């Protein structure tokens, strides 16, 4: 039957309107895989005809307009909208052409405002990616979740924008005629779907400059002249239409803002060149001033001995005219900046009649008139209205909230910026979807494309400005939150996020400091996040604090008490994943234990020196929670740590107790090695928690108290037994093959080197008898074995490199401090 009959058959009208709501539901939030499939059911011809179908009912007309926007426009629109708040202005010849006001002759300081959205915009926005929908093309030969992401289905936009202008013009004229039968059955159903389509096209930037001039004519044909016809703002429109009008105007306000930002960036390009030239000429004049000066050169050349960040602060420090003595900029350059500081204020309507004459007065006058005309009942309309009204008045503050995201780049990196922003748009677009294997593969390769981009390393300030570290953080927060107890799914994607953040911190100090603010969030998410293997979320925390003494000092005790309480739990049962894999159950987890210990090791040791405040807080928490030490040195029922290390040696050597015994998994946990690696990290932590000698010779009260506590908790007798323990050696035999041990399940030189620091920092060497007594028993056969392995065939083995680092980093330096 004719679809126009549903205006009387209300039974099917509700069902079909709900059907179009289901179509928008199943193609909502970027699901372009299905948004392609919908084009078969609703053809392009059907949608385009339904745009002009003036006898369609209310719900069906609005449902079909919204369905067209959802299927063909919303996926590209959302991604473009998220990049409308960033201003990456490249330094290009067309960037230089951008001016605050159009060239004219009415006023140099304040000409009449140009038409908003009309002109050239140089701010970088990634291009849209559409695809012609064809259902008979050959299916992809590759497997699932390997093909590239489906794009938005294509639709003619050059004709679509002209059509969108056309019905909008018809609606404006028809509204003026005050017809008793408006299109669609009501004024709201006549204007709201059309204004939605115009708003979406405006956001996507489909409309050209002439088209924008038209839209400004239908909005207000008198104020917005350049040099019945009643504007949309004077037609007594309902509340629902008013919301779309607010969306249109806030778009034009954004265009005015972006015009201001680009104009300022162009002024920066025109100003830096002159300022550099003048400062270079003044450098030569300062060089020749030695012939007519004296010892007072330092005051004037402190500018050139100061890096440029505070140089521009001094150079531009002439705003209030009471500070002109230090500034060496001539009056023409000073006048230039004072000139641009006046027209910028005029462009924002600061300082300088019923005609509004501009968008700034037009929006304020209209919004106030709407509010005083009637009690507005829509909360969304009220918030949109006063958001607009606040933006018109607070012109400068609105610019202030936008400036930290502004950034200028060289023209040689625009294509890399496009190749980066597209991947960033992928990450942002995956925030609104439940993570799955398809999305996981769509973003791991996105992050990998971010790594191989030069702009990621060259512009850390830009990378922080775009806030990538956030979007990756909430992606990790979402996946950790999902299945937070039962199972942390997608480990390959969690390690992708964590690896990216860890590499993000190492770029620069400011990025590292930015990550340091998110430290508190990471601990509880890493409390169960350690189950996966690889770049754990804990490693992000450790990389955020390492090598920065400021961040290490700034780290607070409430962050550490979480870690020690977590180690308290980790010391009374095994790893739950290890329990599930059939590992021989043990009453304390060595995996999560060592993972905590390395972080504490990075927390209390900076640039070769211990941090006293961190060291004393961590040691008083370990003593306050004695269960963290493990089975040995526990206290009640716990023998010496030597009784643990040989026990771990036997367990590591003996099968069916080393692990599950079904690396084999490339990260297979060997519990015999895990016990003795845990205690190796524990002794490394204690040695790096040892108070410094300069504090001991100064005799500080807590320094002696804490180091005595370390002495009592760690007896030296079992320590020498740990020194005296042997190594498993690659022995020549069995037809010449190198019979080597497995470092993942055997004694390693690292564990002993973890001790050499402890002994060198807690007890020390003062007398020769105790020096040679420990050197000859354990430190001697290690290096005799090193000499034996140091041959043409064995010096490149897996133990030989460890032995070289073991001796030359811990043992031989120790001998250098014990030589007298």
């Amino acid at each position: 039957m004719d679809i126009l009959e549903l205006s009387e058959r209300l039974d099917l009208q509700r069902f079909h309107s709900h059907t179009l709501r289901l179509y928008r539901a199943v193609c909502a939030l970027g699901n372009n895989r299905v948004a392609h499939a919908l084009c078969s059911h609703v053809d392009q011809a059907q949608l385009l005809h339904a745009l002009e179908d003036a006898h369609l009912p209310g719900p069906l007309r609005a449902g079909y307009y919204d369905l067209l926007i959802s299927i063909h426009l919303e996926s590209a629109c959302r991604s473009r909208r998220s990049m409308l708040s960033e201003y990456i202005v490249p330094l290009t010849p067309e960037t230089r052409a951008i001016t605050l006001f159009p060239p004219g002759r009415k006023g140099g300081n304040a000409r009449r405002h140009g038409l908003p959205g009309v002109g050239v915009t140089t701010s970088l926005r990634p291009p849209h990616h559409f695809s012609p929908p064809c259902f008979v093309a050959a299916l992809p030969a590759a497997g699932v979740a390997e093909a590239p992401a489906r794009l938005s289905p294509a639709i003619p936009l050059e004709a679509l924008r002209d059509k969108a202008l056309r019905m909008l013009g018809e609606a404006v004229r028809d509204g003026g005629q005050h017809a008793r039968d408006p299109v669609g059955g009501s004024v709201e159903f006549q204007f709201v779907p059309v204004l939605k389509l115009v708003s979406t096209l405006l956001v996507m930037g489909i409309f050209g400059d002439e088209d924008v001039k038209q839209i400004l004519k239908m909005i207000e044909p008198e104020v917005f002249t350049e040099e019945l016809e009643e504007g949309l703002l004077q037609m007594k429109l309902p509340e629902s239409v008013k919301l779309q009008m607010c969306n249109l105007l806030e778009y034009f306000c954004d265009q005015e803002l972006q015009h201001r930002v680009e104009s300022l960036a162009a002024f920066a390009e025109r100003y830096v060149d002159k300022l550099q030239a003048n400062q270079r000429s003044r450098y030569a004049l300062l060089m020749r001033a030695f012939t007519m000066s004296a010892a007072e050169t330092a005051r004037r050349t402190r500018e050139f001995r100061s890096p440029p960040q505070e140089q521009i602060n001094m150079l531009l420090h002439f705003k209030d005219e009471a500070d002109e003595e230090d500034c060496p900029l001539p009056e023409d350059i000073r006048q230039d900046l004072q000139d641009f500081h006046q027209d910028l204020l005029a462009h924002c309507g600061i300082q300088l009649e019923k005609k509004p004459q501009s968008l700034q007065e037009l929006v304020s006058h209209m919004v106030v008139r709407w509010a005083q005309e009637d009690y507005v009942q829509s909360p969304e309309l009220v918030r949109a209205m006063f958001s607009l009204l606040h933006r018109q008045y607070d012109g400068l503050g609105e610019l202030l909230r936008a400036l930290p995201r502004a950034y200028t780049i060289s023209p040689s990196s625009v294509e890399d910026t496009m190749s980066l922003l597209e991947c960033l748009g992928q990450i942002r677009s995956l925030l609104i979807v439940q993570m799955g294997p398809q999305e996981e593969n769509l973003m791991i390769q996105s992050i990998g494309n971010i790594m191989n981009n030069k702009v990621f390393y060259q512009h850390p300030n830009l990378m922080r400005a775009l806030g990538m570290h956030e979007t990756v953080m909430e992606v990790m927060v979402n996946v950790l939150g999902g299945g937070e107890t039962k199972e942390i799914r997608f480990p390959k994607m969690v390690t992708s996020c964590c690896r990216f953040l860890c590499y993000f911190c190492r770029i620069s100090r400011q990025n590292q400091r930015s990550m340091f603010d998110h430290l508190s969030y990471l601990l509880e998410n890493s409390g169960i996040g350690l189950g996966m293997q690889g770049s754990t979320p804990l490693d992000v925390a450790a990389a955020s604090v390492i090598d920065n003494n400021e961040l290490a000092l700034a780290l607070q005790e409430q962050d550490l008490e979480k870690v020690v309480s977590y180690l308290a739990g980790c010391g009374l049962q095994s790893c739950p994943m290890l329990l599930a894999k059939g590992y021989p159950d043990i009453g304390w987890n060595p995996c999560g234990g060592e993972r905590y210990l390395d972080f504490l090791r990075f927390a209390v040791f900076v640039n070769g020196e211990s941090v006293e405040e961190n060291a004393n807080v961590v040691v008083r928490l370990l003593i306050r929670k004695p269960e963290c030490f493990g089975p040995a040195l526990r206290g009640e029922g716990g023998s010496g740590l030597l009784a643990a290390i040989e026990e771990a040696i036997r367990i590591s050597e003996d099968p069916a107790r080393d692990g599950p015994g079904v690396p084999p998994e490339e990260n297979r946990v060997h519990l015999g090695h895990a016990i003795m690696s845990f205690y190796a990290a524990l002794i490394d932590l204690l040695g790096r928690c040892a108070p410094e000698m300069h504090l001991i010779q100064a005799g500080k009260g807590e320094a002696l108290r804490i180091r005595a506590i370390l002495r009592s908790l760690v007896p030296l007798d079992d320590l020498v037994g740990i020194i005296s323990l042997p190594l498993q050696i690659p022995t020549l035999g069995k037809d010449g093959a190198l019979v080597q041990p497995k470092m993942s399940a055997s004694f390693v030189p690292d564990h002993k080197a973890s001790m050499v620091l402890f002994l060198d920092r807690v007890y020390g060497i003062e007398n020769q008898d105790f020096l040679l007594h420990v050197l000859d028993v354990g430190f001697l056969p290690d290096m005799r074995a090193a000499a034996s392995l140091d041959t043409a065939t064995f010096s490149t083995t897996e133990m030989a490199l460890a032995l070289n680092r073991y001796l030359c980093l811990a043992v031989l330096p120790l001998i250098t401090k014990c030589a007298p």
């Binding site: 330094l91 550099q276 270079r280 450098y283 521009i312 009637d374 606040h390 400036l403 060289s410 620069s508």
Partner: protein, 375 residues
């Protein structure tokens, strides 16, 4: 290295422009003055062009300023677990707060003009529910410190400046007929989360400038990033300033309301929780004295940390004065039976030795005179 660091003329154009924008905004835009708040509220408070209509209905549809307050009091009263940040509310609450105050032998004639003009500024707001919406977002925040509370208390102070009697009457009436406990549960929570002086944080701050790290973008001379001891001093100052403003003018009806709430289901003794905060502050400042007891001179950072803590202690004593003046016999018996005495003795012990120590030199006259006005 400073002799050989790169001069400005050798910097790339894009990098130089990036530094230039930050220098320009930080030295020309932040310092720029534009007080549009008064004319914003003036525009929003005029119900012009329909007064000639003279609508029959009594209702009298709200003017634009009243519509903001109604909308924000709707978001305030909606039932949500967390009161999420609203940058629009920050903008408009700040605009309303900054649109009221507008501020050597000046006579008693023009002061009667100035204070009456201030009352007109406040009447322009509180006649439109602005007192109630402030009370609502204080209850709605549920004890979570943030820009929500800071801009709400900033507005509550600007509407209560000078102890506006009708504003206190409106707030007291709204609390007494709504009978909600969340307002004082929040006030108790914020007062408990207010920070005091920490020696451990101070020692870490001392070692921060010892390192004196710089940044990659040029060089910053002793970067003044966030100070972490009494960071919320301004927030504790204007929380107690708001509490003082409520009971100012000997409002015995509200003074008895802070001590106990007959209408509410449970009674929260704000006076006692004020003493408890004062005790925490006095223990902190006493320990901060004990750390400088050995040292003969107090460095600049130490002086600033006193000045911030002392200004907050001055505000706390002023608020405690306003709780008992009138006199309020209930509060007087409450403070007598409270733990105020231990804080008093501790302050006296701090006062004595601090005056002798600061009188030995002329570099701590500022600190010592703030000690005099504090005691």
């Amino acid at each position: 290295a400073c002799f050989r660091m790169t001069p400005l003329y050798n910097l790339p154009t894009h990098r130089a422009c990036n530094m230039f924008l930050e220098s320009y905004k930080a030295a020309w835009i932040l310092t720029e003055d534009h007080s549009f708040e008064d004319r914003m509220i003036d525009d929003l408070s005029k119900a012009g062009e329909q007064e000639e209509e003279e609508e029959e209905v009594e209702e009298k549809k709200p003017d634009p300023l009243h519509q903001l307050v109604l909308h924000f009091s709707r978001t305030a009263l909606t039932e949500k677990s967390k009161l999420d940040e609203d940058y629009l509310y920050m903008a408009y609450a700040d605009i309303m707060a900054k649109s009221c105050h507008l501020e050597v032998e000046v006579s008693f004639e023009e002061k009667e003009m100035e204070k009456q003009r201030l009352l007109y500024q406040q009447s322009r707001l509180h006649t439109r529910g602005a007192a109630e919406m402030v009370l609502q977002m204080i209850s709605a925040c549920k004890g979570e410190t943030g820009a929500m509370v800071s801009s709400t208390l900033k507005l509550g102070i600007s509407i209560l400046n000078g102890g506006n009697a009708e504003v206190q009457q409106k707030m007291l009436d709204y609390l007494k007929d709504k009978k909600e406990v969340g307002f004082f549960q929040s006030i108790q929570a914020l007062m408990q989360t207010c920070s005091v002086l920490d020696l451990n944080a101070f020692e870490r701050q001392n070692k921060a400038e010892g390192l004196g790290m710089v940044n990659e973008d040029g060089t910053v001379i002793n970067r003044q990033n966030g100070e972490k001891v009494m960071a919320d001093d301004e927030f504790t100052q204007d929380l107690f300033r708001f509490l003082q403003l409520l009971c100012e003018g000997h409002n015995n009806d509200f003074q008895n309301y802070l001590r106990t709430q007959t209408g509410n289901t449970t009674t929260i003794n704000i006076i006692i929780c004020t003493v408890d905060y004062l005790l925490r502050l006095q223990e902190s400042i006493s320990d901060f004295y004990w750390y400088y007891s050995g040292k003969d001179v107090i460095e600049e950072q130490g002086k600033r940390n006193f000045s911030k803590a002392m200004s907050v202690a001055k505000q706390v004593f002023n608020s405690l004065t306003e709780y008992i003046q009138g006199p309020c016999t209930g509060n007087q018996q409450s403070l007598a039976h409270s733990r105020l005495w231990d804080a008093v003795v501790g302050f006296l012990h701090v006062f004595a030795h601090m005056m002798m120590k600061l009188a030995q030199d002329s570099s701590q006259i500022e600190l010592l005179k703030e000690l005099l006005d504090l005691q």
